[PDB]
Amino acid sequence: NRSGDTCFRCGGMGHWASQCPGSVP
Ligand SMILES: [Zn+2]
Predict the structure, then answer these.
(1) Which residue numbers delimit the CCHC-type domain (predicted)?
(2) What spacing in Å lies between the alpha carbon of 4 and ligand 1's midpoint?
(3) d(CA 7, CA 21)
(4) How far is it, in rounded angstroms, from Cα 12 to Cα 21?
(5) Which residues surround ligand 1, an ion (CB under 5 A)?
(6) List of residues 6+ apart from 19 with CB closer than 8 A
(7) For residues 21 and 11, is the Cβ–Cβ distance under 8 A?
């Protein structure tokens, strides 16, 4: 958002890699 917070785990951004949605796809 206001930083280079590119979420490398999901390929998205805005959140940290450990918080990617994947419990219930
Ligand atoms: Zn993510």
Answers:
(1) 7-21
(2) 13
(3) 12
(4) 11
(5) 7, 9-10, 20
(6) 7
(7) no
